[PDB]
Structures are given as structure tokens and as C-alpha cells.
């Protein structure tokens, strides 16, 4: 199938820092898993990410919805890509947000 990357952040604290990358996720923007783990996907982005967008995301978290977004990520080395952003929400049985999953997919064509 098509390229793709998988993330998995933890929505029990309170900004959702990242607790599992795919190998592809490190591969495509540059990073290590020292540099990732235990952040919030946030890092990702620059001075082109468009603002309007990130609210989509930031929103969408906070109500407990899935959302999909296009943004402008940087990889490590500065230079750009563009991300399909894809969130969704894990719920326990109690209807509680336990951990948000996110796919990236390099739609810079
Ligand atoms: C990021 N992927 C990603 C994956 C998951 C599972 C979640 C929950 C979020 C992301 N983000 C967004 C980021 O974590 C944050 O929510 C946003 O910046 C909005 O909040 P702020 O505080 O900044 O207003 C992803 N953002 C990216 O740029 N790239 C991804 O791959």
C-alpha cells in the first residue's frame, strides 16, 4: 500500500507527548527516538505550518474528535515536507480518552 507513518500519544498527560513511533516516522522526518519520546508532535513544525490548521488539531484534541489536517512539517536537517495528518481517538470502555494514534502521510507528491 501506500507510505505511511504511525505514532501513538499518550492523552493521559496533559500535552500528549508521543510514546511510540514506527520506524518510518523516525526515517521520514529525521529524528531519533531520544529526540521524540516523551514530546508532543509539536516539534514538527515551523514557520510555514499554517496556524489556522494546527487549531483544527489542537480543537479536536481537546473535544476528544478525530480530525484530518494538511500541514507543513520540517524534517531534523530543516528542510520541508508535506504531512496528511490523520488523529484519532482511543477511548477506554468508560468513554474516557486514553491515547490519540496519528498517521503521516508525505503527500509532497
Ligand atoms: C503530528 N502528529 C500528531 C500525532 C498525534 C497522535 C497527535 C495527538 C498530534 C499530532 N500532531 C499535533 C501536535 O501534537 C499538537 O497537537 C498540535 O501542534 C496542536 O497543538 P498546539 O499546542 O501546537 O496548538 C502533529 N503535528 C505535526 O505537525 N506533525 C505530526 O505528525
Redesign the pocket.
Known amino acids: 500500500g501506500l507510505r505511511h507513518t504511525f ?3 499518550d492523552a493521559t498527560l496533559p500535552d ?1 507527548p ?1 510514546v511510540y513511533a514506527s520506524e518510518g516516522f523516525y526515517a521520514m522526518t529525521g529524528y531519533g527516538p531520544d529526540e521524540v519520546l516523551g514530546h ?3 516539534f ?2 515551523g514557520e510555514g ?1 499554517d496556524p489556522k490548521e ?2 483544527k ?2 480543537d479536536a ?1 481537546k473535544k476528544g474528535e478525530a480530525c484530518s489536517v494538511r ?1 507543513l ?1 520540517y524534517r531534523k536537517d530543516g528542510t520541508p515536507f508535506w ?1 496528511l ?1 490523520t ?1 484519532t481517538p482511543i477511548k477506554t470502555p468508560d468513554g474516557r480518552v486514553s491515547k ?3 498517521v ?1 502521510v508525505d503527500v509532497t507528491s
Open positions: 505514532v501513538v500519544a500528549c508521543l508532543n508532535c509539536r514538527l513544525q505550518t494546527v487549531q488539531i489542537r484534541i500541514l512539517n504531512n495528518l488523529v490519540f494514534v496519528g503521516q
